C-alpha cells in the first residue's frame, strides 16, 4: 500500500528506526505521530551509526520529506541539539524537516515536574526517561500547554508563558518542595530559536491529504511499543501517548480509511526498559546472553534492558489493536548458538486458569505465569544472512511457528544492524 | 460496511443521537469511544423523548448491545443516575450495558478542579460543561487516575484514592483557595456501587475483535464535534478528547483498517455552545430565527447555542481529518420560510488573502471573515417529509450545492426530531 505504518508490537526497541530507513528508499514523506525525544532509534549504514530521538528515521535520504506531526511533543532544546549535530555530518536537516504548528512544547518546567513526580512515587517509579513527556502531554489535555504556533506572536506568548509557569512553580516549590524554574531563562532559550522553529512550520493534515490525492508514498513511524499505549498498555507503567495504530490519525491528521498497510516490528526475543509487568522475563543466565549478545542497552538512557522470551499472548494482542497487515522479525541472529528456544503460548492465571488473552493493567498482571513451548535452536549462525536460503531449518521452523501462533505473515526478516543486512519477502508498498 | 462510525462534523449537536438510534435497527453492538456525560444526545420516538449523556443511543433496541469503551471517562454517579431513570421507563439497562475496565473514573474532585479552573481563567473561560472531563482526562495522561478495573480490589483502591485526592486537595485549597473534597465521602459513594459497575465490565477490544471475525454490525457513536478535537480543534476552546475518527481505535481498541464507513453528521446551519472562534456566527435577527425555530438550547447545560450560517471551509476540514465516506444532513426543515440562505465558501484573512483552508487554533482564527454565497430559500415547508420527492427545488438545490463544495455525498436527509422523519438515500451498512 501507499500509506504504510511501522510501529513496535511490544515494549519498544523492536527495531523500528532501522526498518523505517530501509523502507524509505521508495517513499516521499515519513511522519512521526507521537512521543517525544524519549524514543531512541538506531540506524546503521556501512557501520556509520546514527541515533535519532525526535527527528524521523527518514532524515538521511534526500528524496523523502520528514514531517513532525501534531501527535509529537516538541522540545525546542532537543531539536536544536539534534539538528546541529546532524548538519555537521553533511545532512541538511533544515532543507528537509517540516512540522506541525499544533505540536505542544516541552520546556524545562516539564522536565522539573516529570523528575519531581518520579521522586514523589519512590517505591513505585514508572522509570520514565526523564524527558518531561508526561507533563508536556498533561498540560496539553489540560488545555494550558504552549504549541509551536504560539511562538509566532512573541508579546502574546510571554503572557501565556508567564501564566503556566506561575502555576507550575507554585506546585514545584510548595508541593514537592523542589527548586523553581526561572521564567526569564525559559523565555530566552525559546525566543533564541522561535524563528528557526517557526520557519519549518507546515499544515500537515492538509499536505498529507495532498500527498494522497496523488498516491504519494507516506511512511508513518512509530515510537515506543504497543504495551506502552496509555489506554491499552500496562497502566500505569506506560507512555502518555497512543503508540498503537490509532495514534496515526490523531497525531498526524490523516483519515483512518487511508491506512493501507500496518507493519509491526517484532524483536524475536523480549526487552522492556523502565518498570512494570513482564511475564517471560529472564533473570537467569539466558537473560545475560540475550542482553550481552543483543547489545541491549537503552538508546536514550543507556539503561540496561530487561530481556526475556518472546511472548506470543502479548503479541496476539498487538495484532488485534493494531490490525497489523504484516510483521518484520528483527534480531533472529541474536539467537544463534542457543541449545533451544522457547516462546510464551498461554498464561496460567493466579487461580489456576490457563488463558491466552493478556490482562490489561499493571496490578491485574501481578500473579500470572508463562506456559512456554520449547524449540530446538541452532548452533549455525544467521548474522548478515540476506536470503531465506541461508537460514538453517531450526530458524525457519521458529519463524513459521510464530506465524502459526499469530496468523500474521513475516514479511521482513532482520539479521543484524546494518541497513543492508535484511531480508524482504514482501515489500509493504507494492503489497 | 460492517463497522460504521457516526460523529459530528462541526462543533457538536449536529444530530448524532437521532441517527445512531435510527441506524441501530440493523446493528449488533454500538460503541461509545470518547467523552463523558458532557455529550448531550436527544432521541425522539413517537413523541416520547430521551436524552442520554453517557449511555449510548442504542440503549432502547433490544437487539443491540451497548458498550462503553476505554475512550470514555466514566462517572459512577452519572451512570447510576441515568441507568435508574431509564429502567423506570421499562428499559432493562443492566441487561444490555457493558463497559471497559480501562475507563478512567470521574469523581467529585475532578468537578471541583474543572470548575475552580474555569474561575481561575475568568475573562478567558472555555465554557466547559462543568462535568470535570478535563481533569478526569489529565490525571489519565498524568498516569495517576483511577480506572474501572481498580474498583475490583477495595483495599488496594482506598490507598490509591487517598494518594490522588491528597495532591488534588493540596491544590484545591492552597492554590485556588477553594474548598476541599472529603475523601471519606468520595470513597463511600464509589464503594456504594463498585459491584454494579464491576459486573458490567468486559474485555471490549477483544469482543469487538470477535464481532468482526463474524461480520457483526457495529456502530461507533461520536461525542462532540470535529472542531472540538483536542489536537485538531480550535485550541484551547476544545474538549479533551479526540472526537475525530482516530478516537475510535484509541478509544475502543478496534484496529484502524476495520473502519468501513465513516458517516459525518451535518446540521444544515451552525451552532456552537461554549466559547471560541466562530466566523459565520449570526448576531442578528436571522440568528434568532435559526435558534428559535431549531430549538437550539444545550442538551446538557440548557445554555442557548450560538447559531450562524453553514461553514463549508470548516466542513471541508472534517471531511479530511475524518475520511468521511458520507454525510447525513440534519435540520433542513429548520430552514423553511427564509427569503434566502447563505453558506461560507472561503475565508478572507486579516491581511487580504482569500483562503479556503481553516486556521487551526483560537488566536489564529482571530481576524478571519466569511465570504458567503447566496441562495434562494423556500417558503414551502419540508418538516416531516420522508422522500426526496416532497422536497422543493430550492432545497434540493441547496443540497447538491453542499455536495459540490465538499465532494462528499448526502446519504441521509433529516427533516425533524422523530426517528421516523428521516430520508435514507443510502444505508451505510450495505454500502
Ligand atoms: N543484531 C541485530 N541488531 C539489530 C537488528 N535490527 C536492528 N538492530 C539493531 O538493534 C537495535 C534496536 O534498538 P532501537 O534502535 O532502540 O530500536 P527502536 O525502538 O525501533 O528505535 C539497534 O542497534 C539496531 O540498529 C537485527 O536484525 N540484528
Ligand atoms: N427539526 C429537527 N430537529 C432535529 C432533526 N434531527 C434531530 N433533531 C433534533 O435536534 C436536536 C439535536 O441536538 P442534540 O440531540 O444535542 O445532538 P447530538 O449532539 O448529536 O447529540 C435534538 O432535538 C434532535 O432530536 C431534524 O432533522 N430536524
Ligand atoms: O514517560 P516516558 O518517558 O515515555 O517513560 C515512561 C515509560 O516509557 C518507557 N519508554 C519511553 N520511551 C521508550 C522507548 S523509545 P523507542 O522504542 O521509540 O525507540 N523504549 C522503551 N521504553 C520507553 C520508559 O522506559 C518508561 O518505562
Ligand atoms: O470540557 P468540556 O466540558 O467538554 O467542554 C469544553 C467545551 O466542550 C464543549 N462541549 C462539550 N461537549 C459538548 C457537546 S455534547 P454532544 O455533541 O456529544 O451531544 N456539544 C457542544 N459543546 C460541547 C463545551 O461547550 C465547551 O465549549
Ligand atoms: O530507544 C529507546 N530507549 O530505550 C529509551 C530509553 O533508553 O530511555
Ligand atoms: O448536547 C450537548 N450539549 O450541548 C452539551 C451542553 O449543553 O453542555
Ligand atoms: Mg528505541
Ligand atoms: Mg448534543
JSON list of N, CA, C and O in Angstrom, two decimals, chain A residues 124 140-141 143 145 147 160 163 203 205 209 231-232 235 238 240 250 255 257 317 320 323-325 360 363, chain B residues 124 140-141 143 145 147 160 163 203 205 209 231-232 235 238 240 250 255 257 317 320 323-325 360 363:
[
{"chain": "A", "resi": 124, "resn": "UNK", "atom": "N", "xyz": [7.43, 3.21, 43.70]},
{"chain": "A", "resi": 124, "resn": "UNK", "atom": "CA", "xyz": [6.63, 2.79, 42.56]},
{"chain": "A", "resi": 124, "resn": "UNK", "atom": "C", "xyz": [6.96, 3.53, 41.25]},
{"chain": "A", "resi": 124, "resn": "UNK", "atom": "O", "xyz": [6.11, 3.55, 40.33]},
{"chain": "A", "resi": 140, "resn": "UNK", "atom": "N", "xyz": [-1.25, 19.61, 27.77]},
{"chain": "A", "resi": 140, "resn": "UNK", "atom": "CA", "xyz": [-1.96, 19.54, 26.51]},
{"chain": "A", "resi": 140, "resn": "UNK", "atom": "C", "xyz": [-3.44, 19.24, 26.75]},
{"chain": "A", "resi": 140, "resn": "UNK", "atom": "O", "xyz": [-4.33, 19.99, 26.37]},
{"chain": "A", "resi": 141, "resn": "UNK", "atom": "N", "xyz": [-3.71, 18.12, 27.37]},
{"chain": "A", "resi": 141, "resn": "UNK", "atom": "CA", "xyz": [-5.09, 17.76, 27.64]},
{"chain": "A", "resi": 141, "resn": "UNK", "atom": "C", "xyz": [-5.74, 18.69, 28.69]},
{"chain": "A", "resi": 141, "resn": "UNK", "atom": "O", "xyz": [-6.98, 18.81, 28.76]},
{"chain": "A", "resi": 143, "resn": "UNK", "atom": "N", "xyz": [-5.53, 21.67, 28.50]},
{"chain": "A", "resi": 143, "resn": "UNK", "atom": "CA", "xyz": [-5.77, 22.87, 27.72]},
{"chain": "A", "resi": 143, "resn": "UNK", "atom": "C", "xyz": [-4.98, 24.11, 28.16]},
{"chain": "A", "resi": 143, "resn": "UNK", "atom": "O", "xyz": [-5.46, 25.25, 28.01]},
{"chain": "A", "resi": 145, "resn": "UNK", "atom": "N", "xyz": [-1.23, 24.03, 27.72]},
{"chain": "A", "resi": 145, "resn": "UNK", "atom": "CA", "xyz": [0.09, 23.97, 27.13]},
{"chain": "A", "resi": 145, "resn": "UNK", "atom": "C", "xyz": [0.37, 24.97, 25.99]},
{"chain": "A", "resi": 145, "resn": "UNK", "atom": "O", "xyz": [-0.56, 25.55, 25.41]},
{"chain": "A", "resi": 147, "resn": "UNK", "atom": "N", "xyz": [1.97, 25.61, 22.22]},
{"chain": "A", "resi": 147, "resn": "UNK", "atom": "CA", "xyz": [2.18, 24.88, 20.97]},
{"chain": "A", "resi": 147, "resn": "UNK", "atom": "C", "xyz": [3.23, 25.53, 20.10]},
{"chain": "A", "resi": 147, "resn": "UNK", "atom": "O", "xyz": [3.77, 26.55, 20.49]},
{"chain": "A", "resi": 160, "resn": "UNK", "atom": "N", "xyz": [1.14, 34.20, 28.26]},
{"chain": "A", "resi": 160, "resn": "UNK", "atom": "CA", "xyz": [0.83, 32.78, 28.38]},
{"chain": "A", "resi": 160, "resn": "UNK", "atom": "C", "xyz": [1.94, 32.04, 29.15]},
{"chain": "A", "resi": 160, "resn": "UNK", "atom": "O", "xyz": [1.68, 31.39, 30.15]},
{"chain": "A", "resi": 163, "resn": "UNK", "atom": "N", "xyz": [1.85, 32.74, 32.63]},
{"chain": "A", "resi": 163, "resn": "UNK", "atom": "CA", "xyz": [0.69, 32.13, 33.25]},
{"chain": "A", "resi": 163, "resn": "UNK", "atom": "C", "xyz": [0.82, 30.65, 33.69]},
{"chain": "A", "resi": 163, "resn": "UNK", "atom": "O", "xyz": [0.39, 30.27, 34.80]},
{"chain": "A", "resi": 203, "resn": "UNK", "atom": "N", "xyz": [1.26, 23.03, 7.28]},
{"chain": "A", "resi": 203, "resn": "UNK", "atom": "CA", "xyz": [-0.06, 22.49, 7.56]},
{"chain": "A", "resi": 203, "resn": "UNK", "atom": "C", "xyz": [-0.07, 20.99, 7.22]},
{"chain": "A", "resi": 203, "resn": "UNK", "atom": "O", "xyz": [-0.48, 20.58, 6.14]},
{"chain": "A", "resi": 205, "resn": "UNK", "atom": "N", "xyz": [-1.87, 18.10, 8.34]},
{"chain": "A", "resi": 205, "resn": "UNK", "atom": "CA", "xyz": [-3.08, 17.39, 7.96]},
{"chain": "A", "resi": 205, "resn": "UNK", "atom": "C", "xyz": [-3.37, 17.56, 6.48]},
{"chain": "A", "resi": 205, "resn": "UNK", "atom": "O", "xyz": [-3.53, 16.56, 5.79]},
{"chain": "A", "resi": 209, "resn": "UNK", "atom": "N", "xyz": [-3.06, 15.11, 3.05]},
{"chain": "A", "resi": 209, "resn": "UNK", "atom": "CA", "xyz": [-4.24, 14.95, 2.23]},
{"chain": "A", "resi": 209, "resn": "UNK", "atom": "C", "xyz": [-3.84, 15.13, 0.76]},
{"chain": "A", "resi": 209, "resn": "UNK", "atom": "O", "xyz": [-4.35, 14.42, -0.11]},
{"chain": "A", "resi": 231, "resn": "UNK", "atom": "N", "xyz": [-3.74, 3.97, 26.88]},
{"chain": "A", "resi": 231, "resn": "UNK", "atom": "CA", "xyz": [-5.04, 3.38, 27.13]},
{"chain": "A", "resi": 231, "resn": "UNK", "atom": "C", "xyz": [-4.90, 1.86, 27.26]},
{"chain": "A", "resi": 231, "resn": "UNK", "atom": "O", "xyz": [-5.31, 1.24, 28.28]},
{"chain": "A", "resi": 232, "resn": "UNK", "atom": "N", "xyz": [-4.32, 1.26, 26.22]},
{"chain": "A", "resi": 232, "resn": "UNK", "atom": "CA", "xyz": [-4.20, -0.18, 26.13]},
{"chain": "A", "resi": 232, "resn": "UNK", "atom": "C", "xyz": [-2.96, -0.81, 26.73]},
{"chain": "A", "resi": 232, "resn": "UNK", "atom": "O", "xyz": [-2.78, -2.02, 26.64]},
{"chain": "A", "resi": 235, "resn": "UNK", "atom": "N", "xyz": [-1.03, -0.13, 32.31]},
{"chain": "A", "resi": 235, "resn": "UNK", "atom": "CA", "xyz": [-1.19, 1.08, 33.11]},
{"chain": "A", "resi": 235, "resn": "UNK", "atom": "C", "xyz": [-0.89, 0.69, 34.55]},
{"chain": "A", "resi": 235, "resn": "UNK", "atom": "O", "xyz": [-1.27, -0.40, 34.98]},
{"chain": "A", "resi": 238, "resn": "UNK", "atom": "N", "xyz": [3.28, 3.00, 31.51]},
{"chain": "A", "resi": 238, "resn": "UNK", "atom": "CA", "xyz": [3.17, 3.24, 30.11]},
{"chain": "A", "resi": 238, "resn": "UNK", "atom": "C", "xyz": [3.65, 4.63, 29.73]},
{"chain": "A", "resi": 238, "resn": "UNK", "atom": "O", "xyz": [4.01, 5.46, 30.58]},
{"chain": "A", "resi": 240, "resn": "UNK", "atom": "N", "xyz": [2.70, 8.33, 27.71]},
{"chain": "A", "resi": 240, "resn": "UNK", "atom": "CA", "xyz": [1.48, 9.13, 27.71]},
{"chain": "A", "resi": 240, "resn": "UNK", "atom": "C", "xyz": [0.81, 9.29, 26.39]},
{"chain": "A", "resi": 240, "resn": "UNK", "atom": "O", "xyz": [-0.09, 10.13, 26.23]},
{"chain": "A", "resi": 250, "resn": "UNK", "atom": "N", "xyz": [-4.84, 10.60, 14.88]},
{"chain": "A", "resi": 250, "resn": "UNK", "atom": "CA", "xyz": [-4.97, 11.66, 15.88]},
{"chain": "A", "resi": 250, "resn": "UNK", "atom": "C", "xyz": [-3.72, 12.49, 15.86]},
{"chain": "A", "resi": 250, "resn": "UNK", "atom": "O", "xyz": [-3.78, 13.72, 15.96]},
{"chain": "A", "resi": 255, "resn": "UNK", "atom": "N", "xyz": [-7.01, 10.75, 7.62]},
{"chain": "A", "resi": 255, "resn": "UNK", "atom": "CA", "xyz": [-8.20, 9.95, 7.88]},
{"chain": "A", "resi": 255, "resn": "UNK", "atom": "C", "xyz": [-7.93, 8.45, 7.97]},
{"chain": "A", "resi": 255, "resn": "UNK", "atom": "O", "xyz": [-7.22, 7.87, 7.14]},
{"chain": "A", "resi": 257, "resn": "UNK", "atom": "N", "xyz": [-9.44, 5.74, 7.10]},
{"chain": "A", "resi": 257, "resn": "UNK", "atom": "CA", "xyz": [-9.63, 4.82, 5.97]},
{"chain": "A", "resi": 257, "resn": "UNK", "atom": "C", "xyz": [-8.44, 4.87, 4.95]},
{"chain": "A", "resi": 257, "resn": "UNK", "atom": "O", "xyz": [-8.41, 4.18, 3.90]},
{"chain": "A", "resi": 317, "resn": "UNK", "atom": "N", "xyz": [-2.03, -9.78, 21.11]},
{"chain": "A", "resi": 317, "resn": "UNK", "atom": "CA", "xyz": [-2.75, -8.55, 21.47]},
{"chain": "A", "resi": 317, "resn": "UNK", "atom": "C", "xyz": [-2.56, -7.40, 20.49]},
{"chain": "A", "resi": 317, "resn": "UNK", "atom": "O", "xyz": [-3.53, -6.73, 20.10]},
{"chain": "A", "resi": 320, "resn": "UNK", "atom": "N", "xyz": [-4.16, -7.51, 17.03]},
{"chain": "A", "resi": 320, "resn": "UNK", "atom": "CA", "xyz": [-5.54, -7.11, 17.33]},
{"chain": "A", "resi": 320, "resn": "UNK", "atom": "C", "xyz": [-5.84, -5.59, 17.43]},
{"chain": "A", "resi": 320, "resn": "UNK", "atom": "O", "xyz": [-6.75, -5.07, 16.77]},
{"chain": "A", "resi": 323, "resn": "UNK", "atom": "N", "xyz": [-4.41, -4.08, 13.97]},
{"chain": "A", "resi": 323, "resn": "UNK", "atom": "CA", "xyz": [-4.83, -4.50, 12.63]},
{"chain": "A", "resi": 323, "resn": "UNK", "atom": "C", "xyz": [-3.59, -4.58, 11.71]},
{"chain": "A", "resi": 323, "resn": "UNK", "atom": "O", "xyz": [-3.56, -4.06, 10.60]},
{"chain": "A", "resi": 324, "resn": "UNK", "atom": "N", "xyz": [-2.57, -5.26, 12.22]},
{"chain": "A", "resi": 324, "resn": "UNK", "atom": "CA", "xyz": [-1.34, -5.44, 11.51]},
{"chain": "A", "resi": 324, "resn": "UNK", "atom": "C", "xyz": [-1.67, -6.23, 10.29]},
{"chain": "A", "resi": 324, "resn": "UNK", "atom": "O", "xyz": [-2.42, -7.21, 10.36]},
{"chain": "A", "resi": 325, "resn": "UNK", "atom": "N", "xyz": [-1.04, -5.84, 9.19]},
{"chain": "A", "resi": 325, "resn": "UNK", "atom": "CA", "xyz": [-1.15, -6.48, 7.90]},
{"chain": "A", "resi": 325, "resn": "UNK", "atom": "C", "xyz": [0.01, -7.46, 7.85]},
{"chain": "A", "resi": 325, "resn": "UNK", "atom": "O", "xyz": [-0.12, -8.54, 7.26]},
{"chain": "A", "resi": 360, "resn": "UNK", "atom": "N", "xyz": [-4.85, -6.47, 31.45]},
{"chain": "A", "resi": 360, "resn": "UNK", "atom": "CA", "xyz": [-4.64, -5.18, 30.83]},
{"chain": "A", "resi": 360, "resn": "UNK", "atom": "C", "xyz": [-4.62, -4.11, 31.87]},
{"chain": "A", "resi": 360, "resn": "UNK", "atom": "O", "xyz": [-5.61, -3.40, 32.02]},
{"chain": "A", "resi": 363, "resn": "UNK", "atom": "N", "xyz": [-1.48, -4.08, 37.97]},
{"chain": "A", "resi": 363, "resn": "UNK", "atom": "CA", "xyz": [-1.96, -4.94, 39.07]},
{"chain": "A", "resi": 363, "resn": "UNK", "atom": "C", "xyz": [-2.63, -6.25, 38.61]},
{"chain": "A", "resi": 363, "resn": "UNK", "atom": "O", "xyz": [-2.48, -7.29, 39.23]},
{"chain": "B", "resi": 124, "resn": "UNK", "atom": "N", "xyz": [-11.26, 34.45, 30.19]},
{"chain": "B", "resi": 124, "resn": "UNK", "atom": "CA", "xyz": [-11.00, 33.57, 29.07]},
{"chain": "B", "resi": 124, "resn": "UNK", "atom": "C", "xyz": [-11.60, 32.16, 29.21]},
{"chain": "B", "resi": 124, "resn": "UNK", "atom": "O", "xyz": [-11.13, 31.23, 28.53]},
{"chain": "B", "resi": 140, "resn": "UNK", "atom": "N", "xyz": [-5.50, 10.95, 33.74]},
{"chain": "B", "resi": 140, "resn": "UNK", "atom": "CA", "xyz": [-5.29, 9.80, 32.88]},
{"chain": "B", "resi": 140, "resn": "UNK", "atom": "C", "xyz": [-3.91, 9.87, 32.23]},
{"chain": "B", "resi": 140, "resn": "UNK", "atom": "O", "xyz": [-3.08, 8.99, 32.38]},
{"chain": "B", "resi": 141, "resn": "UNK", "atom": "N", "xyz": [-3.67, 10.92, 31.49]},
{"chain": "B", "resi": 141, "resn": "UNK", "atom": "CA", "xyz": [-2.38, 11.06, 30.85]},
{"chain": "B", "resi": 141, "resn": "UNK", "atom": "C", "xyz": [-1.24, 11.31, 31.86]},
{"chain": "B", "resi": 141, "resn": "UNK", "atom": "O", "xyz": [-0.05, 11.07, 31.56]},
{"chain": "B", "resi": 143, "resn": "UNK", "atom": "N", "xyz": [-0.91, 9.64, 34.31]},
{"chain": "B", "resi": 143, "resn": "UNK", "atom": "CA", "xyz": [-0.73, 8.31, 34.88]},
{"chain": "B", "resi": 143, "resn": "UNK", "atom": "C", "xyz": [-1.06, 8.17, 36.37]},
{"chain": "B", "resi": 143, "resn": "UNK", "atom": "O", "xyz": [-0.45, 7.37, 37.08]},
{"chain": "B", "resi": 145, "resn": "UNK", "atom": "N", "xyz": [-4.67, 8.59, 37.39]},
{"chain": "B", "resi": 145, "resn": "UNK", "atom": "CA", "xyz": [-6.10, 8.39, 37.53]},
{"chain": "B", "resi": 145, "resn": "UNK", "atom": "C", "xyz": [-6.55, 6.98, 37.94]},
{"chain": "B", "resi": 145, "resn": "UNK", "atom": "O", "xyz": [-5.78, 6.01, 37.85]},
{"chain": "B", "resi": 147, "resn": "UNK", "atom": "N", "xyz": [-9.18, 3.83, 37.34]},
{"chain": "B", "resi": 147, "resn": "UNK", "atom": "CA", "xyz": [-9.94, 3.22, 36.25]},
{"chain": "B", "resi": 147, "resn": "UNK", "atom": "C", "xyz": [-11.08, 2.36, 36.76]},
{"chain": "B", "resi": 147, "resn": "UNK", "atom": "O", "xyz": [-11.25, 2.26, 37.97]},
{"chain": "B", "resi": 160, "resn": "UNK", "atom": "N", "xyz": [-4.68, 4.16, 46.86]},
{"chain": "B", "resi": 160, "resn": "UNK", "atom": "CA", "xyz": [-4.63, 4.94, 45.63]},
{"chain": "B", "resi": 160, "resn": "UNK", "atom": "C", "xyz": [-5.53, 6.18, 45.74]},
{"chain": "B", "resi": 160, "resn": "UNK", "atom": "O", "xyz": [-5.08, 7.31, 45.56]},
{"chain": "B", "resi": 163, "resn": "UNK", "atom": "N", "xyz": [-4.13, 8.69, 47.83]},
{"chain": "B", "resi": 163, "resn": "UNK", "atom": "CA", "xyz": [-2.98, 9.29, 47.21]},
{"chain": "B", "resi": 163, "resn": "UNK", "atom": "C", "xyz": [-3.23, 10.46, 46.23]},
{"chain": "B", "resi": 163, "resn": "UNK", "atom": "O", "xyz": [-2.54, 11.50, 46.25]},
{"chain": "B", "resi": 203, "resn": "UNK", "atom": "N", "xyz": [-14.13, -7.33, 28.32]},
{"chain": "B", "resi": 203, "resn": "UNK", "atom": "CA", "xyz": [-12.92, -7.07, 27.55]},
{"chain": "B", "resi": 203, "resn": "UNK", "atom": "C", "xyz": [-13.32, -6.57, 26.15]},
{"chain": "B", "resi": 203, "resn": "UNK", "atom": "O", "xyz": [-13.39, -7.33, 25.19]},
{"chain": "B", "resi": 205, "resn": "UNK", "atom": "N", "xyz": [-11.85, -4.48, 23.64]},
{"chain": "B", "resi": 205, "resn": "UNK", "atom": "CA", "xyz": [-11.00, -4.65, 22.47]},
{"chain": "B", "resi": 205, "resn": "UNK", "atom": "C", "xyz": [-11.20, -6.02, 21.85]},
{"chain": "B", "resi": 205, "resn": "UNK", "atom": "O", "xyz": [-11.49, -6.11, 20.67]},
{"chain": "B", "resi": 209, "resn": "UNK", "atom": "N", "xyz": [-13.14, -7.52, 18.41]},
{"chain": "B", "resi": 209, "resn": "UNK", "atom": "CA", "xyz": [-12.37, -8.35, 17.50]},
{"chain": "B", "resi": 209, "resn": "UNK", "atom": "C", "xyz": [-13.20, -9.59, 17.14]},
{"chain": "B", "resi": 209, "resn": "UNK", "atom": "O", "xyz": [-13.17, -10.03, 15.99]},
{"chain": "B", "resi": 231, "resn": "UNK", "atom": "N", "xyz": [-6.57, 17.93, 19.54]},
{"chain": "B", "resi": 231, "resn": "UNK", "atom": "CA", "xyz": [-5.41, 18.20, 18.72]},
{"chain": "B", "resi": 231, "resn": "UNK", "atom": "C", "xyz": [-5.79, 19.13, 17.56]},
{"chain": "B", "resi": 231, "resn": "UNK", "atom": "O", "xyz": [-5.18, 20.22, 17.37]},
{"chain": "B", "resi": 232, "resn": "UNK", "atom": "N", "xyz": [-6.79, 18.69, 16.81]},
{"chain": "B", "resi": 232, "resn": "UNK", "atom": "CA", "xyz": [-7.22, 19.40, 15.61]},
{"chain": "B", "resi": 232, "resn": "UNK", "atom": "C", "xyz": [-8.27, 20.47, 15.78]},
{"chain": "B", "resi": 232, "resn": "UNK", "atom": "O", "xyz": [-8.71, 21.07, 14.80]},
{"chain": "B", "resi": 235, "resn": "UNK", "atom": "N", "xyz": [-8.02, 25.12, 19.48]},
{"chain": "B", "resi": 235, "resn": "UNK", "atom": "CA", "xyz": [-7.36, 25.11, 20.79]},
{"chain": "B", "resi": 235, "resn": "UNK", "atom": "C", "xyz": [-7.22, 26.57, 21.21]},
{"chain": "B", "resi": 235, "resn": "UNK", "atom": "O", "xyz": [-6.94, 27.42, 20.36]},
{"chain": "B", "resi": 238, "resn": "UNK", "atom": "N", "xyz": [-11.64, 23.65, 23.19]},
{"chain": "B", "resi": 238, "resn": "UNK", "atom": "CA", "xyz": [-11.97, 22.34, 22.73]},
{"chain": "B", "resi": 238, "resn": "UNK", "atom": "C", "xyz": [-12.26, 21.39, 23.87]},
{"chain": "B", "resi": 238, "resn": "UNK", "atom": "O", "xyz": [-12.15, 21.73, 25.06]},
{"chain": "B", "resi": 240, "resn": "UNK", "atom": "N", "xyz": [-11.36, 17.59, 25.72]},
{"chain": "B", "resi": 240, "resn": "UNK", "atom": "CA", "xyz": [-10.08, 16.93, 25.96]},
{"chain": "B", "resi": 240, "resn": "UNK", "atom": "C", "xyz": [-9.88, 15.62, 25.28]},
{"chain": "B", "resi": 240, "resn": "UNK", "atom": "O", "xyz": [-8.95, 14.87, 25.60]},
{"chain": "B", "resi": 250, "resn": "UNK", "atom": "N", "xyz": [-8.35, 4.30, 19.32]},
{"chain": "B", "resi": 250, "resn": "UNK", "atom": "CA", "xyz": [-7.69, 4.54, 20.60]},
{"chain": "B", "resi": 250, "resn": "UNK", "atom": "C", "xyz": [-8.68, 4.33, 21.71]},
{"chain": "B", "resi": 250, "resn": "UNK", "atom": "O", "xyz": [-8.35, 3.76, 22.75]},
{"chain": "B", "resi": 255, "resn": "UNK", "atom": "N", "xyz": [-8.80, -2.22, 15.48]},
{"chain": "B", "resi": 255, "resn": "UNK", "atom": "CA", "xyz": [-7.78, -1.81, 14.53]},
{"chain": "B", "resi": 255, "resn": "UNK", "atom": "C", "xyz": [-8.29, -0.90, 13.42]},
{"chain": "B", "resi": 255, "resn": "UNK", "atom": "O", "xyz": [-9.33, -1.15, 12.81]},
{"chain": "B", "resi": 257, "resn": "UNK", "atom": "N", "xyz": [-7.73, -0.49, 10.27]},
{"chain": "B", "resi": 257, "resn": "UNK", "atom": "CA", "xyz": [-8.11, -0.99, 8.94]},
{"chain": "B", "resi": 257, "resn": "UNK", "atom": "C", "xyz": [-9.54, -1.63, 8.93]},
{"chain": "B", "resi": 257, "resn": "UNK", "atom": "O", "xyz": [-10.06, -2.12, 7.91]},
{"chain": "B", "resi": 317, "resn": "UNK", "atom": "N", "xyz": [-12.79, 20.71, 6.16]},
{"chain": "B", "resi": 317, "resn": "UNK", "atom": "CA", "xyz": [-11.77, 20.22, 7.10]},
{"chain": "B", "resi": 317, "resn": "UNK", "atom": "C", "xyz": [-12.06, 18.84, 7.69]},
{"chain": "B", "resi": 317, "resn": "UNK", "atom": "O", "xyz": [-11.16, 17.98, 7.73]},
{"chain": "B", "resi": 320, "resn": "UNK", "atom": "N", "xyz": [-11.78, 15.72, 5.51]},
{"chain": "B", "resi": 320, "resn": "UNK", "atom": "CA", "xyz": [-10.33, 15.49, 5.50]},
{"chain": "B", "resi": 320, "resn": "UNK", "atom": "C", "xyz": [-9.72, 14.71, 6.71]},
{"chain": "B", "resi": 320, "resn": "UNK", "atom": "O", "xyz": [-9.02, 13.72, 6.53]},
{"chain": "B", "resi": 323, "resn": "UNK", "atom": "N", "xyz": [-11.93, 11.34, 6.90]},
{"chain": "B", "resi": 323, "resn": "UNK", "atom": "CA", "xyz": [-12.08, 10.36, 5.82]},
{"chain": "B", "resi": 323, "resn": "UNK", "atom": "C", "xyz": [-13.54, 9.89, 5.77]},
{"chain": "B", "resi": 323, "resn": "UNK", "atom": "O", "xyz": [-13.85, 8.70, 5.71]},
{"chain": "B", "resi": 324, "resn": "UNK", "atom": "N", "xyz": [-14.44, 10.87, 5.78]},
{"chain": "B", "resi": 324, "resn": "UNK", "atom": "CA", "xyz": [-15.85, 10.61, 5.73]},
{"chain": "B", "resi": 324, "resn": "UNK", "atom": "C", "xyz": [-16.13, 9.95, 4.42]},
{"chain": "B", "resi": 324, "resn": "UNK", "atom": "O", "xyz": [-15.59, 10.38, 3.39]},
{"chain": "B", "resi": 325, "resn": "UNK", "atom": "N", "xyz": [-17.00, 8.95, 4.47]},
{"chain": "B", "resi": 325, "resn": "UNK", "atom": "CA", "xyz": [-17.46, 8.20, 3.33]},
{"chain": "B", "resi": 325, "resn": "UNK", "atom": "C", "xyz": [-18.74, 8.90, 2.89]},
{"chain": "B", "resi": 325, "resn": "UNK", "atom": "O", "xyz": [-19.03, 8.96, 1.69]},
{"chain": "B", "resi": 360, "resn": "UNK", "atom": "N", "xyz": [-6.03, 26.98, 12.55]},
{"chain": "B", "resi": 360, "resn": "UNK", "atom": "CA", "xyz": [-6.18, 25.84, 13.42]},
{"chain": "B", "resi": 360, "resn": "UNK", "atom": "C", "xyz": [-5.64, 26.14, 14.77]},
{"chain": "B", "resi": 360, "resn": "UNK", "atom": "O", "xyz": [-4.54, 25.70, 15.08]},
{"chain": "B", "resi": 363, "resn": "UNK", "atom": "N", "xyz": [-6.44, 31.79, 18.57]},
{"chain": "B", "resi": 363, "resn": "UNK", "atom": "CA", "xyz": [-5.80, 33.06, 18.19]},
{"chain": "B", "resi": 363, "resn": "UNK", "atom": "C", "xyz": [-5.60, 33.23, 16.67]},
{"chain": "B", "resi": 363, "resn": "UNK", "atom": "O", "xyz": [-5.73, 34.33, 16.13]}
]
